[PDB]
Amino acid sequence: SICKSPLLVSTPLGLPRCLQASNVVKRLQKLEDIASLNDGNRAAATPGYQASVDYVKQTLQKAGYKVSVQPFPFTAYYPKGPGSLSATVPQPVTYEWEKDFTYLSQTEAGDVTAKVVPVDLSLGAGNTSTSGCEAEDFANFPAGSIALIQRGTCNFEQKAENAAAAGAAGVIIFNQGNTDDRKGLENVTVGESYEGGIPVIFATYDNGVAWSQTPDLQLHLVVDVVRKKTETYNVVAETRRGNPNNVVMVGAHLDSVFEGPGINDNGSGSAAQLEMAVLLAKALPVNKVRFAWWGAEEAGLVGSTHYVQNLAPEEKKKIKAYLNFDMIGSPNFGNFIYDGDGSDFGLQGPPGSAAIERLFEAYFRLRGQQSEGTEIDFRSDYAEFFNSGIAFGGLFTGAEGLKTEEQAQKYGGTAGKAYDECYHSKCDGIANINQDALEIHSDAMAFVTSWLSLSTKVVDDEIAAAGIERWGHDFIK
Ligand code: NA
Ligand code: NA
Ligand code: NA
Ligand SMILES: [Zn+2]
Ligand SMILES: [Zn+2]
Ligand SMILES: [Zn+2]
Ligand SMILES: [Zn+2]
């Protein structure tokens, strides 16, 4: 009733009043029901994702929006079982899955036994290895061997594809070892676009050093995964009203990991943004508001990156600001605002990102809540907007990091536990939501979206004055 009036939903203090976490939770329950009917997940290239798309689309159509379901090619990747790695020559040694070695995400499967050949290594503290980054590194590389490659400088995908082009049967990339914190296993990917055709694993630095100095070494490596070329979808809609040349865009990825329902990650952002879009159907914005639900974020930001890269330059220039909402209901939440001004972590977003951050900061302060910065190093769907020079910001309640004592004093909850203990897990379901955090973060999403829908001047002022290790969850280099 009252929240159908343009006088409420058009303005920054009216829209949050109308956007209730309890109503967002009803949408989260629908996503939970979808997961339960579709093998327990809403992952890219699954019926659970398709049913999520259908729900978002129908909801938007019922609220009066035209909806664009935008397909894009997508190579799905699924680990089927643990990997194996053993030395056969000069002496039999069994290496330990998830201790000595792990998979590169998006690797091909394989079962390979071959001589191990090091490629352009530069060992030791402080090294600036470029191992495997240039085709010349593989001059005189014997086809059929396993390439032993050191992390450094360029993307894992480039190292592995260069090895494949030299006829390698498999690739072992070991951590760089230039600092003490770069010697263990890490979450690493060859990218959804990997086309090397051969298996690729990651190993600890010390294992790489020792293997590189073992004469006659042969390793037997088994990678048990499946890749499948298919497609997935973004869902895009925009208000009929508002300046089409000054678009305020909001996004939230709609896919989960395969491991679970993805209710906090990222049902929370998807559902809050959907409630906001439904409310904004009755608003009278000055600037057009565009809403995107991204596919395949968990595979390396594939949907959001595809959307931005495929916009005609004229269309890209019309997007003035991008706001990203990825995980905003964490049970053990902190109040995190993207650090667009680099005040905390030294990485600055494109001009206008500071103004967006300041809007979120001021809103949290007005509500009597504390907040703090979080990193913007290409961890979610703003990445390609950032890369394209578009001002951006966003909100986050925390994932696998452990809450600090100071944060427990500011936000409550439990110090020493993850902000979200069900991150990327089967338990990321309907119970894995803090409704107080969801309420405040949805309120702030609504306030800043509505503010910018009336005036982008704070962003425009910074644009006028002005004159990559990860890509999503995994490290690309
Ligand atoms: Na080289
Ligand atoms: Na692709
Ligand atoms: Na990952
Ligand atoms: Zn997410
Ligand atoms: Zn995630
Ligand atoms: Zn900051
Ligand atoms: Zn509220």
Residue numbers in the entry: 44 to 510, 527 to 536
Sentences from the paper on this structure:
Here we investigated the aminopeptidase, P. aeruginosa aminopeptidase (PaAP) from P. aeruginosa, which is highly abundant in the biofilm matrix. PaAP is associated with biofilm development and contributes to nutrient recycling. PaAP contains an M28 Zn peptidase domain (residues 44–116 and 274–510) and a PA domain (residues 117–273).
We solved the structure of PaAP in multiple forms, which revealed an interesting self-inhibitory mechanism involving the PA domain and the propeptide C-terminus. The structure of full-length PaAP was solved to 1.4 Å, and traceable between residues 44 to 536 with a 16 amino acid region (QKAQSRSLQMQKSASQ) near the C-terminus, which lacked density. The location of the C-terminus appears to block access to the active site residues.
